[PDB]
Amino acid sequence: TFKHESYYATVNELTPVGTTIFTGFSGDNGIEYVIQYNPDDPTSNDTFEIPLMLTGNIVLRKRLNYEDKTRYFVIIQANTTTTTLTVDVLDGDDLGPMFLPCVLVPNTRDCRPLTYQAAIPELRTPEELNPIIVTPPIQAIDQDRNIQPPSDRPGILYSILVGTPEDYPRFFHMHPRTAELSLLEPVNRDFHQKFDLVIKAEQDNGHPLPAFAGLHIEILD
C-alpha cells in the first residue's frame, strides 16, 4: 500500500525526452513499479515510462505540447496496489507572437494573412498628420497565453522589415514598442503613389520567433 493515495508533478512543456520528471516514490515515500494503461486517459502510458522498475522514477517518453494537452493521469501499480499521478504541463516559450486580428484558416491553427491599411494625404506635414492611423490597429501578442511566472514573459518589438518602393525609410518610422507609425516628411504623389511594407513582430528575449503582416499605405490628393 502507498503512503499518500495520490501524487502530483509539474513538467515544463520544453522538457526534453529522457528527462526524469518525478522521483517521489524514492525516500520511503512510495517493490516493482510499472505504468498501467489508463482507459480514462489513453495516451498517458505512451507519454511516461518507468525504465528502472525497482526505483519507480518516471521519465518523459514523448514530447509534450501545452497547446494539445495540459494534464495527464498516470496510473502506477506496485508489486498489488495502484495510485494516480496527476501531471500538469507548464506552458513554455515555444511560440512567438501573432498579429490581431487572427481569423483562423479553416482546418489549421494558422491565422489568415493580414494586411493593415493606412492612407496619407499628399503635401501635408508630419506635424498635421501624425500619428498615422492604421486600420485595424497594429497589435501583436504572445501565442503562449499562460507563461508563468509573469516576469518570464517577453516583450514584443515591432518593425518595418522590408518595403516597396525602397525609399520608405525616408518617409516612415515605426515605434518599436507601440507600433505607432510616423510620417517623417511630406509625400508628393508625383513621386510616390503607394507603399507596400512588411511588418515584423518578434520577442525581445533572444528567441524572436517572428510573425509578419502587410501594411499597405495609399497616398491621396
- Tell me: does residue 65 bind a copy of itself (CB under 8 A): yes
Q: C-alpha cell of 178?
A: 507601440
Q: Which of residues 145-204 bind a copy of itself (CB under 8 A)?
A: 161-162, 198, 200
- Tell me: does residue 156 bind Ca ion (CB under 5 A): no
Q: State the Cα–Cα distance between residues 83 and 132, nearest whole angstrom.
A: 62
**Nearest to 92, CA basis, from 157, 145, 21:** 145
Q: Which of residues 11, 21, 91, 187 is near Ca ion by CB under 5 A? A: 91
For residues 59 to 88, the per-residue mask of contacts with Ca ion, x marking binding by CB under 5 A and - elsewhere, is -------x----------------------
Q: Which of residues 31, 52, 53, 105 is near a copy of itself by CB under 8 A? A: 105
- Tell me: does residue 212 bind a copy of itself (CB under 8 A): yes
Q: Which of residues 32, 110, 185, 218 is near a copy of itself by CB under 8 A? A: 110
Helix-strand-coil split of the chain, %, nearest 5: 5, 40, 55
Pick the closer one to a copy of itself by CB: 14 or 220: 14
Helix (H, G, I), strand (E, B) or coil at 127: helix
Q: Could you tell me how many helices (H) and strands (E) the chain has, helices first?
A: 2, 15
